[PDB]
Design an enzyme around this catalytic site. Structure first.
Site, mmCIF file in Angstrom:
data_model
loop_
_atom_site.group_PDB
_atom_site.id
_atom_site.type_symbol
_atom_site.label_atom_id
_atom_site.label_comp_id
_atom_site.label_asym_id
_atom_site.label_seq_id
_atom_site.Cartn_x
_atom_site.Cartn_y
_atom_site.Cartn_z
ATOM 1 N N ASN A 197 42.116 48.951 32.079
ATOM 2 C CA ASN A 197 42.494 47.535 32.082
ATOM 3 C C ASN A 197 41.937 46.842 30.833
ATOM 4 O O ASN A 197 40.781 47.012 30.472
ATOM 5 C CB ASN A 197 41.907 46.913 33.351
ATOM 6 C CG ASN A 197 42.369 45.480 33.663
ATOM 7 O OD1 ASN A 197 41.700 44.764 34.363
ATOM 8 N ND2 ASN A 197 43.556 45.042 33.150
ATOM 9 N N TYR A 202 47.486 32.794 29.551
ATOM 10 C CA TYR A 202 46.377 33.187 30.400
ATOM 11 C C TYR A 202 45.133 32.374 30.079
ATOM 12 O O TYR A 202 44.837 32.112 28.914
ATOM 13 C CB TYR A 202 46.135 34.678 30.153
ATOM 14 C CG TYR A 202 44.872 35.243 30.728
ATOM 15 C CD1 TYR A 202 44.790 35.593 32.075
ATOM 16 C CD2 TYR A 202 43.750 35.426 29.928
ATOM 17 C CE1 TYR A 202 43.615 36.114 32.605
ATOM 18 C CE2 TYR A 202 42.578 35.941 30.446
ATOM 19 C CZ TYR A 202 42.513 36.281 31.780
ATOM 20 O OH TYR A 202 41.329 36.773 32.281
ATOM 21 N N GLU A 235 41.092 31.667 37.449
ATOM 22 C CA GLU A 235 41.756 32.456 36.419
ATOM 23 C C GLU A 235 43.241 32.290 36.655
ATOM 24 O O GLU A 235 43.712 32.456 37.772
ATOM 25 C CB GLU A 235 41.348 33.940 36.617
ATOM 26 C CG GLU A 235 41.981 34.899 35.587
ATOM 27 C CD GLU A 235 41.586 36.342 35.847
ATOM 28 O OE1 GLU A 235 41.583 36.758 37.005
ATOM 29 O OE2 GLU A 235 41.316 37.063 34.885
ATOM 30 N N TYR A 265 47.568 32.597 35.311
ATOM 31 C CA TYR A 265 48.603 33.302 34.531
ATOM 32 C C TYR A 265 49.961 32.589 34.651
ATOM 33 O O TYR A 265 50.378 32.165 35.724
ATOM 34 C CB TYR A 265 48.883 34.687 35.143
ATOM 35 C CG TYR A 265 47.814 35.730 34.978
ATOM 36 C CD1 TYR A 265 46.697 35.756 35.825
ATOM 37 C CD2 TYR A 265 48.011 36.762 34.074
ATOM 38 C CE1 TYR A 265 45.771 36.793 35.724
ATOM 39 C CE2 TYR A 265 47.096 37.788 33.974
ATOM 40 C CZ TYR A 265 45.991 37.822 34.778
ATOM 41 O OH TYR A 265 45.080 38.856 34.707
ATOM 42 N N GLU A 280 48.156 42.050 28.517
ATOM 43 C CA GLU A 280 47.252 42.751 29.417
ATOM 44 C C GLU A 280 47.893 44.077 29.773
ATOM 45 O O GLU A 280 49.100 44.188 29.910
ATOM 46 C CB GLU A 280 47.013 41.913 30.694
ATOM 47 C CG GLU A 280 46.185 42.687 31.734
ATOM 48 C CD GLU A 280 45.600 41.792 32.830
ATOM 49 O OE1 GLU A 280 45.759 40.564 32.765
ATOM 50 O OE2 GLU A 280 44.980 42.349 33.746
#
Ligand code: NA
Ligand code: NA
Length: 190
Positions: free
Chosen positions: A44, A77, A86, A88, A177
């Site tokens: 990741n 993001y 967080e 997106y 990502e």
């Protein structure tokens, strides 16, 4: 240039590049708001350029080529503090949709496409303030694209109407990502 994980400023733009320790990712900052990433069987990672701090009304422009071979996202993001969130706004993705591991609250029609809105709770996970439990907010674009503009207010306001509160903004970037996949991308932000 090609750099290691970290945050900083390059050619007028904030950048953040993070990964989970697995190799195979090359992140490169370019002129202005440009960056490119090439990954081969990575774990990741998240990397991209934008602003520190972001705002709740920014209209973000992006353009480039995005070629994921597996699980990957291309999103606006960022994070907020108090509450710690967080978030997106996913403009394009590979083989994995965020809807799987999240819960749908509604939809918003923005910048030419319907987006599905979700919230997920990250329990005891890494964050900009260390291990923490916090909510993640998502708008996922139904019609994938590699260029255009994102009026972030459309999403933040829609989230608010669904009861999703955002705190004071920390960074806000356009990020590529990847999650245990391969791919290549080159993006310019403004
Ligand atoms: Na796609
Ligand atoms: Na964890």
């Amino acid at each position: 240039q090609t750099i290691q994980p970290g945050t900083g400023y390059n050619n007028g733009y904030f950048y953040s590049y993070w990964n989970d320790g697995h190799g195979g990712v090359t992140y490169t900052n370019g002129p202005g708001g440009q960056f490119s990433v090439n990954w081969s069987n990575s774990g990741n990672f998240v990397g991209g350029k934008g602003w520190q701090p972001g705002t709740k009304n920014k209209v973000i422009n992006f353009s480039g080529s995005y070629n994921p071979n597996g699980n990957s996202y291309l999103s606006v993001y960022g994070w907020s503090r108090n509450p710690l969130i967080e978030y997106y706004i996913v403009e394009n993705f590979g083989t994995y949709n965020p809807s799987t591991g999240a819960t749908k609250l509604g939809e918003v029609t923005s910048d030419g496409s319907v987006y599905d809105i979700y919230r997920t709770q990250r329990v005891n996970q890494p964050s900009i303030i260390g291990t923490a439990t916090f909510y993640q907010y998502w708008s996922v674009r139904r019609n994938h694209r590699s260029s255009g503009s994102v009026n972030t207010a459309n999403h933040f306001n829609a989230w608010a109407q669904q009861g999703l509160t955002l705190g004071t903004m920390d960074y806000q970037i356009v990020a590529v990502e990847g999650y245990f996949s391969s791919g290549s991308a080159s993006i310019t932000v403004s």
